[PDB]
Amino acid sequence: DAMTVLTPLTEKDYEGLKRVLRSLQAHKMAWPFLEPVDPNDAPDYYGVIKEPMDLATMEERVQRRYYEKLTEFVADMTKIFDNCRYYNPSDSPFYQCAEVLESFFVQKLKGFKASRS
Ligand SMILES: Cn1ncc(Nc2ccc(CN)cc2)c(Cl)c1=O
Ligand SMILES: [Ca+2]
């Protein structure tokens, strides 16, 4: 909505962002996304995926107050899942993790936006 696009993230907001990030990191199906993709696990991953992203990179950015608006936090998180569904076929375990964990992220994001008032 309006707040998501326009309102700068505060320290109070960042407590909520850390909580969302921690809940995804704790999720059983987040295991493929905790750390940057290992090129030795994924042939030509870094020649195919132009903007890699992972939850540890996101954790560093949250710690550093990298994000000015919620939209940018959402865009990084969306990269994790969109990258995975582009690189992997739809029957891959990685792809299935992206489906589950994105739906979880959307639930938690909705709770974050509601409590932002
Ligand atoms: C193509 N590809 N390859 C790997 C991967 N995640 C991952 C993370 C940790 C381990 C254990 N080292 C193994 C796999 C993802 Cl998400 C992906 O899209
Ligand atoms: Ca995308």
UniProtKB/Swiss-Prot annotation:
Tissue distribution: Ubiquitously expressed, with highest levels in testis. Present in kidney, liver and brain. In the brain, highest levels are found in motor cortex (at protein level).
Protein name: Nucleosome-remodeling factor subunit BPTF
Subcellular location: Cytoplasm; Nucleus
Domain characteristics, as noted in the entry: The second PHD-type zinc finger mediates binding to histone H3K4Me3.
Residue ranges of every copy of the Bromo domain listed in the record: 8-112
Gene name of the encoded protein: BPTF
Disease affiliated with this protein: Neurodevelopmental disorder with dysmorphic facies and distal limb anomalies: An autosomal dominant neurodevelopmental disorder characterized by variable degrees of developmental delay, intellectual disability, speech delay, postnatal microcephaly, dysmorphic features, and mild abnormalities of the hands and feet.
Known role: Regulatory subunit of the ATP-dependent NURF-1 and NURF-5 ISWI chromatin remodeling complexes, which form ordered nucleosome arrays on chromatin and facilitate access to DNA during DNA-templated processes such as DNA replication, transcription, and repair. The NURF-1 ISWI chromatin remodeling complex has a lower ATP hydrolysis rate than the NURF-5 ISWI chromatin remodeling complex. Within the NURF-1 ISWI chromatin-remodeling complex, binds to the promoters of En1 and En2 to positively regulate their expression and promote brain development.
Processing after translation: Phosphorylation enhances DNA-binding. Highly susceptible to proteolysis.
Sequence similarity: Belongs to the PBTF family.
Subunit: Interacts with MAZ. Interacts with KEAP1. Component of the NURF-1 ISWI chromatin remodeling complex (also called the nucleosome-remodeling factor (NURF) complex) at least composed of SMARCA1 (isoform 2), BPTF, RBBP4 and RBBP7. Within the complex interacts with isoform 2 of SMARCA1. Component of the BPFT-SMARCA1 complex at least composed of SMARCA1 (isoform 1), BPFT, RBBP4 and RBBP7; the complex is catalytically inactive and does not remodel chromatin. Within the complex interacts with isoform 1 of SMARCA1.
